Amino acid sequence: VQGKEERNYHIFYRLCAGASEDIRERLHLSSPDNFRYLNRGCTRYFANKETDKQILQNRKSPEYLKAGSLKDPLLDDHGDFIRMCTAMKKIGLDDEEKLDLFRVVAGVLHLGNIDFEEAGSTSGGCNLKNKSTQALEYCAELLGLDQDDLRVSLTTRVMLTTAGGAKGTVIKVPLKVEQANNARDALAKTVYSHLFDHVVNRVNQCFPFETSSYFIGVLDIAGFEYFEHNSFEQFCINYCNEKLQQFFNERILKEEQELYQKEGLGVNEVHYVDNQDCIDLIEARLVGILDILDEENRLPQPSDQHFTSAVHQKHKDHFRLSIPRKSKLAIHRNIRDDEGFIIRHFAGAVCYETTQFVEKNNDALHMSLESLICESRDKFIRELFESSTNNNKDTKQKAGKLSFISVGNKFKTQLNLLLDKLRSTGASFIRCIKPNLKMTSHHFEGAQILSQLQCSGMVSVLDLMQGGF
Amino acid sequence: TTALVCDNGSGLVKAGFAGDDAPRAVFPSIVGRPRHQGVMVGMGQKDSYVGDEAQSKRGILTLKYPIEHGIITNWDDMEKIWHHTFYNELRVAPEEHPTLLTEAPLNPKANREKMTQIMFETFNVPAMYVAIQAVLSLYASGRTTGIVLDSGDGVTHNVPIYEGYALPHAIMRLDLAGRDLTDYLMKILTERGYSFVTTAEREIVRDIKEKLCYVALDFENEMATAASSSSLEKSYELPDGQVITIGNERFRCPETLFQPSFIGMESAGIHETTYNSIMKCDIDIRKDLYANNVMSGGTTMYPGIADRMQKEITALAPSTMKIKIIAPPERKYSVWIGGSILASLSTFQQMWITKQEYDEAGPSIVH
Amino acid sequence: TTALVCDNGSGLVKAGFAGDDAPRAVFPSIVGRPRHQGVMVGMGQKDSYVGDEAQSKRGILTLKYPIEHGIITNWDDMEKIWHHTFYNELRVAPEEHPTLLTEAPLNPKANREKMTQIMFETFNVPAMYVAIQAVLSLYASGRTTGIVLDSGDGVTHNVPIYEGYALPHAIMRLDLAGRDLTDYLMKILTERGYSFVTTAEREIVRDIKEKLCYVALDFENEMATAASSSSLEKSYELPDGQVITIGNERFRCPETLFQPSFIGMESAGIHETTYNSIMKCDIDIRKDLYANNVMSGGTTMYPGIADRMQKEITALAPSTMKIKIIAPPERKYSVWIGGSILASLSTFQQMWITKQEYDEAGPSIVH
Numbered sequence A: 001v002q003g004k005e006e007r008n009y010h011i012f013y014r015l016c017a018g019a020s021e022d023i024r025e026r027l028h029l030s031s032p033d034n035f036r037y038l039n040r041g042c043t044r045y046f047a048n049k050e051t052d053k054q055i056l057q058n059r060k061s062p063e064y065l066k067a068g069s070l071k072d073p074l075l076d077d078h079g080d081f082i083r084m085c086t087a088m089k090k091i092g093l094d095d096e097e098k099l100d101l102f103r104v105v106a107g108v109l110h111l112g113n114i115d116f117e118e119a120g121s122t123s124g125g126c127n128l129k130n131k132s133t134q135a136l137e138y139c140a141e142l143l144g145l146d147q148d149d150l151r152v153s154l155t156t157r158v159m160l161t162t163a164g165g166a167k168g169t170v171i172k173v174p175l176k177v178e179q180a181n182n183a184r185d186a187l188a189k190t191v192y193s194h195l196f197d198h199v200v201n202r203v204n205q206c207f208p209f210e211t212s213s214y215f216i217g218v219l220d221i222a223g224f225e226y227f228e229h230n231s232f233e234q235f236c237i238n239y240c241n242e243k244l245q246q247f248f249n250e251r252i253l254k255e256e257q258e259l260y261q262k263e264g265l266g267v268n269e270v271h272y273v274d275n276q277d278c279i280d281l282i283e284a285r286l287v288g289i290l291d292i293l294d295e296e297n298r299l300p301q302p303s304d305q306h307f308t309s310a311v312h313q314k315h316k317d318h319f320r321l322s323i324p325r326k327s328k329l330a331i332h333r334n335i336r337d338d339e340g341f342i343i344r345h346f347a348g349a350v351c352y353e354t355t356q357f358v359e360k361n362n363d364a365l366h367m368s369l370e371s372l373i374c375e376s377r378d379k380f381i382r383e384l385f386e387s388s389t390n391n392n393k394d395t396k397q398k399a400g401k402l403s404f405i406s407v408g409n410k411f412k413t414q415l416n417l418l419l420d421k422l423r424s425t426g427a428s429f430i431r432c433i434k435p436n437l438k439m440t441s442h443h444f445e446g447a448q449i450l451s452q453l454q455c456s457g458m459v460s461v462l463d464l465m466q467g468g469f
Numbered sequence B, C: 001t002t003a004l005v006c007d008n009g010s011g012l013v014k015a016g017f018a019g020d021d022a023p024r025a026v027f028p029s030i031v032g033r034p035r036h037q038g039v040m041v042g043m044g045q046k047d048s049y050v051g052d053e054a055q056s057k058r059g060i061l062t063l064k065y066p067i068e069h070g071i072i073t074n075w076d077d078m079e080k081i082w083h084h085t086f087y088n089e090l091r092v093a094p095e096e097h098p099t100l101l102t103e104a105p106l107n108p109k110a111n112r113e114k115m116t117q118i119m120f121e122t123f124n125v126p127a128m129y130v131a132i133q134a135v136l137s138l139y140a141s142g143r144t145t146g147i148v149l150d151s152g153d154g155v156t157h158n159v160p161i162y163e164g165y166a167l168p169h170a171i172m173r174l175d176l177a178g179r180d181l182t183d184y185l186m187k188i189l190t191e192r193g194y195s196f197v198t199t200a201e202r203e204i205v206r207d208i209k210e211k212l213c214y215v216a217l218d219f220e221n222e223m224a225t226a227a228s229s230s231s232l233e234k235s236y237e238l239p240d241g242q243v244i245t246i247g248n249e250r251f252r253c254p255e256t257l258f259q260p261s262f263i264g265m266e267s268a269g270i271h272e273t274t275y276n277s278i279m280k281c282d283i284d285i286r287k288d289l290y291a292n293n294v295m296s297g298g299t300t301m302y303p304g305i306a307d308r309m310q311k312e313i314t315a316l317a318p319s320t321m322k323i324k325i326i327a328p329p330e331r332k333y334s335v336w337i338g339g340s341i342l343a344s345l346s347t348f349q350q351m352w353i354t355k356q357e358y359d360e361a362g363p364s365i366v367h
């Protein structure tokens, strides 16, 4: 689910833009307007004057006809697909396996169209739509699935009664329509998630290490991104930059504590730049904002207005949280009470609206469908969703518990696997400043630099440093 | 620690931890003592067998269901049910969790008090609560509006709920299905020359009530075709090797649940009790009680409802008002899968009746 | 800069900025508390739902209109109306605009003080003013002379105004239409066997009071032809599914408004209260009050007026005088279209009650 004027990932535009007719005939691609995971945002390609002449008429959407190629001096979605496969020749992949890295991507695109209506009240449940019959047939040969077994698997909750006495068996309980829309998109956030893990693990075997002991690495990740309106994608970035801001100020105070008593310039103290009240506000167990969100998915009927009134229910205290209409900047005073909130972070007060906030969070890949994509009818595909060559997990299907599984927890838990790995290592902070808007030489903007000094954590270092040396 | 949901079946006790699959243990509640003199001084025989083992040792015991007409007989047998259920099935100690118990929506007071009190002094659990079996059937199919049915051997109920309020005026309790259907099958199977009178054998009748019955779409016309040689005859095979051939009576036993006239008792069928609870609700809300009709329990598992129930209601309801009747699969476990969603969810994690509050307050803490 | 015209309806509070289309938000003014036991522990319930949401959640609330017989019931409910009105409809802070408020023509002292005083201290508006709802209806028609009617559920008024001065000695306020027509419609629909008693359901009476009812041209002769076996029946369909066929009572209720002796109070009909206000003005001016009879207010939207009113007045007034009655579409929003015209103009930019003068003077700034 792509926001307004935003795109998906770049392989879903470079494959659409750069595909030839000897590549399109084996994958059955069409222009971006057709796919629901592409028509949601922006459908335009990045290009330059020379490649603008080469983009085929059958790869163009109505928006592409109206507004043309996007102008950027370095991104070329038509040409960089050619220069992508030169780099796939260089890294360590063959052309037969490169073709198998295009069949998995094209299977995600034809998953992005299935619709589910309400059954004819035939003992409850949902059914697929009549427009989705040829749409399921053109998807199942890409993901390696059977079209008669997949229709059951996208509509039912398979479980067993086998656990003690009598005759045990497997019964089938259909899911609701809204539960089928959240389950169909949960397969696309699982298949592309293990495909990116297969490309990175393949790259790590192109130049394998001799042994391990100490390590010096470079962590690069997205900055404190904040825009005119802030989404669910920006709530996890600004929460990730707040935790990296917690460990940043923790290393600055420790360097001053190991230098003034080590070069002998006396003893001193300072009021530490605590953000624990901001951290507990965002992630505390039971009372935190992210804790209310993973609980909100469990309720009988999800809502986004019922989620918002609960945030100022439990956070009736805490200074770093206010109502959206209280806003310092005028622009966010057109938001109403159960439609957003303002959270002060290390970069200042950033408002977020709550419209579609719960809807973007609620993933759920049930038993009947997680245990179907693991049993895929193609062989390069079954290796992608493990068991792995080294460190095999071997998760069996015969188990019970837990069903839906936590999903508003996976963005914080996976970040905790890196914050405690960083806590055992040293640190070397390199802050990068953009001097102008267009990326042009000799230009300087004091209307662009000062906002990046105040949103990169640099101010917090200067208001911590009061040493006087 | 994870809460434990143990459902006080009318049947048919169900037990399993809070969520998310199915109950660990199900058995039909019976206790049976050994009724003939022992002739092998081994001996190893227990004073009271619970089920499963009391349904394996049929024919040498006298089966006694502890819950009869919707209430527990006495706590001397009930406490032994409980002890067997927690310990020799689920293995966990009650001292390690808050528990969740179920009741009927309308049941003798103060026998919910006495229950709550005895269970606290016998197993000495950290905290607990008692939820009504009907309300939980909303949760099972994630409904926010609608009329709820807990029909088990032998208590039915009809409760109307509107997002997410329960309407006191319209709650209706029928003491009709399903043990009276069990007795009725035994009463119309003597009519075909097969007699069943002793306590153990009564279970076999109940088992044929499960598998082989079905409900008609048009009664009068199913009765017509029964009188001819047109086969509705299915051949059952019986525990000691005997062959039973049933026709007409196969659809007669469940049909009893429409029209209580067959027993002669003064009450009106599920058809009419569904309607009579709706027309005891406020006028504006009636619009959404139509088409949020949710069926539930195990005694609605006949393979000939709900489209009979639909065709009959649609004739009685106001003209051109759309009525969807939603009967899901899994209905035997509906109540339990309901309870599971609740006790796993906060806010209500801090709302169990806890020990210090119970000790101070006493049994009146129930309301 | 831009002012806000927020009209304190007796209905139907209306809110919209100064100029030039229509009000942004109109809603039934009701606050409703939840009156039954809550069983789905979600649950998010608020202290009170206002309308729109209290009109989408009927049958589980207790509706209380905050204005009754032309005076507000208590400011405890009224302030919650205000907070709702500005915030979840208009979407603007009250600190960013001079506002313009209305009250009823001839309203009890100190209800304008207590209002003026609370609204400044609760919302801290930059400046404010209170204009009576009838006077504004002059502007909506562009009149320079004529009698103005603000008739809402349930206080009507009859004010005569000459170029460009109001007469303090000719104004009539009746607490008689339209909420008493609502209660009367409920009193004559019980008369044909459809029983309505509950607060929520009383809104349904208002919806048929709107749509189906009309005024007769001559009562006695429509009553005669009503007695025929010929049909006056119009068929309504109700929320639960029920069908009502009404004939006579359909023209009875809004005919109701002439001859208040149908209820039984001594006050004379709109026919005579119009006339008695005209013959309370100075002699030379009476000439130009004729043909500047302008009807207004939402409770004049029955299609049987104004030519009933016309035919009645022309019979009672002095002969050979040219008397016409002005009735266009828009009358439900007439008052607001008045306010809308005002607040954009100069010189009246300098006639607002400014904050410093309010602080020095206090609430006693009535005159």
Ligand SMILES: Nc1ncnc2c1ncn2[C@@H]1O[C@H](COP(=O)(O)OP(=O)(O)O)[C@@H](O)[C@H]1O
Binding pocket: B008, B009, B010, B011, B012, B013, B150, B151, B152, B153, B178, B206, B209, B210, B211, B297, B298, B299, B300, B301, B302, B303, B331, B332, B333, B335
């Ligand atoms: N397939 C079936 N057809 C008809 N009746 C059944 C079927 N399966 C179970 N039952 C009946 O349902 C009862 C179990 O209902 P249950 O939902 O356990 O009620 P409770 O939960 O109140 O004990 C059993 O007594 C059995 O007779």
Ligand SMILES: Nc1ncnc2c1ncn2[C@@H]1O[C@H](COP(=O)(O)OP(=O)(O)O)[C@@H](O)[C@H]1O
Binding pocket: C008, C009, C010, C011, C012, C013, C150, C151, C152, C153, C178, C206, C209, C210, C211, C297, C298, C299, C300, C301, C302, C331, C332, C333, C335
């Ligand atoms: N078409 C109609 N016919 C008859 N009465 C109507 C019609 N539309 C609205 N009304 C009545 O008019 C009232 C609204 O009048 P309104 O002009 O809002 O008065 P106020 O402005 O004083 O609140 C409602 O209570 C409703 O009963």
Ligand SMILES: [Mg+2]
Binding pocket: B009, B010, B133, B150, B151, B152, B155
């Ligand atoms: Mg039950």
Ligand SMILES: [Mg+2]
Binding pocket: C009, C010, C104, C133, C150, C151, C152, C155
């Ligand atoms: Mg008025």
